[PDB]
């Protein structure tokens, strides 16, 4: 059963989709759920979009991340067209051609954070923590809510360094535990490409 | 058109 969500759209563009969903009897919602099957992204001609929360979750959920052109060209062609040839090809940050969305729906047997325990620590800005934790959960990780509450499986500390007011503070997590401390972008890039990226580029140096 | 709120983008960052 088709359940749809929109991202990156102007109000008049949303109105098109609302009309299109009404014609074909497809559920369109404002909030992304587990029940949601399709995330409809605004892209350019190259099927390249921007990174939104809905975009990340669409990949992490293994959902049909689809360009909004799939709506407009199906309006023009009068029939409801195939999702395969309208799936988004990548994003403005990580790559115009990484088939992130395709590789996520393809590999659900293997999920990118298969054996990791992830704890978010300290302040966070634009993305709700409970959402980023869900995204991490969606790629088959374990969410830990306290630094002491870690458990033959690997721990990772996730931090957003530009949210900290006393910037000397995010080098002090190595004192509390011996687990690695990466930036928030490690999660975000890894979900976007749907490949677990090597922590080396994201690793925050800790104080001895 | 009028005043509409807009969902976050996640640009390049360290």
Domain boundaries, chain A: 1-107, 108-208
CB A35 within 8 A of CB A3: yes
In order of A121, A134, A156, B2, the CA distances from A138 in angstroms are 19, 6, 16, 36
Contact call for A56 and B10, based on CB within 8 A:
yes
Query: What are the phi and psi torsion angles at A110 (to 5°)?
Result: -110, 115
In order of A24, A26, A112, A160, B10, the CA distances from A134 in angstroms are 31, 25, 14, 17, 17
CATH class given for the domain over A1-107: alpha beta
First to last CA, chain A: 54
Nearest to A50 among B1, B9, B13 (CB): B9
Reported resolution in A?
Answer: 3.3
* Closest chain B residue to the Cα of A7, Cα to Cα: B7
Nearest to B10 among A12, A162, A188 (CB): A188
Give the CB-side neighbour count of residue A129, counting CA atoms within 13 A. Answer: 15
- Per the structure block, which two tokens stand in for A160? 């957003």
At A100 the three-state DSSP class reads helix
Substitution target from B5, B9, B11 for chain A, most A beta carbons within 10 A: B9
What is the SS3 assignment for A127-180? CCHHHHHHHHHHCCCEEECCHHHCCCCEEEEEECHHHCCCCCHHHCHHHHCCCC
Residues belonging to chain B: 14
Query: What are the phi and psi torsion angles at A190 (to 5°)?
Result: -65, -35
For this PDB entry, the determination method is: X-ray
Residues of B in contact with A191 (CB under 8 A): none
Instruction: Tell me the C-alpha distance between A197 and A178, whole Å.
Output: 20
**CB within 8 Å of A161: residues ≥ 6 apart:** A167, A170, A183, A204, B14
CATH topology agreement for domains A1-107 and A108-208: yes
Question: Domain A108-208 in CATH: superfamily?
Answer: BRCT domain (3.40.50.10190)
Round the CA-based radius of gyration of chain B to a whole number and report it: 12
Closest CA to A51 of A205, A192, A197: A192
């Amino acid at each position: 059963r088709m359940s749809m969500v929109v991202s990156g759209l102007t109000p008049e563009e949303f109105m098109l989709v609302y009309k299109f969903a009404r014609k074909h009897h497809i559920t369109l919602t404002n909030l992304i759920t587990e029940e949601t099957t399709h995330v409809v992204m605004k892209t350019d001609a190259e099927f390249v979009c921007e990174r939104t929360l809905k975009y990340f979750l669409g990949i992490a959920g293994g959902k049909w991340v689809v360009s909004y052109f799939w709506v407009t060209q199906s309006i023009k062609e009068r029939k409801m067209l195939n999702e395969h040839d309208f799936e988004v090809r990548g994003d403005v940050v990580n790559g115009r051609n990484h088939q992130g969305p395709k590789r996520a729906r393809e590999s659900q047997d293997r999920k990118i954070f298969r054996g990791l325990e992830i704890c978010c620590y300290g302040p966070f800005t634009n993305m709700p923590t409970d959402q980023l934790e869900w995204m991490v959960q969606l790629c088959g990780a374990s969410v830990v809510k306290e630094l002491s509450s870690f458990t033959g499986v690997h721990p990772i500390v996730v931090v957003q360094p530009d949210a900290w007011t006393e910037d000397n503070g995010f080098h002090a997590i190595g004192q509390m535990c011996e687990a690695p401390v990466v930036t928030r972008e490690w999660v975000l890039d890894s979900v976007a490409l749907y490949q677990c990226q090597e922590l080396d580029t994201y690793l925050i140096p800790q104080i001895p | 058109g009028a005043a509409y709120d807009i969902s976050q983008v996640f640009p390049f960052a360290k």
